[PDB]
């Protein structure tokens, strides 16, 4: 599943001068229900 | 022939305190059609 936290918004940041600024924020996280319930396979030279 | 790009605009900058900061920007331009259709006379006695 994806934990998240803070989910992607819209900014209103200052903009005291001729330029305009703007920023995308998000937390997120990840969480597995039982760490053998998958597998990872590494790869590795041949023989 | 005046050429407008952005009109004055009041737009109100940060505040960061007590500041209350404002600002009034315009951009624009000059344009003349050929250099000999108008004219100038410079006032020089010496």
């Given at each position: 599943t994806q934990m998240v936290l803070r989910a992607p918004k819209r900014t209103e940041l200052a903009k005291d001068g001729s330029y305009e600024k703007w920023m995308i924020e998000m937390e997120v996280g990840l969480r597995h229900?039982?760490?053998?319930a998958s597998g990872v396979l590494f790869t590795a030279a041949g023989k």
């Open positions: 229900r039982n760490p053998y």
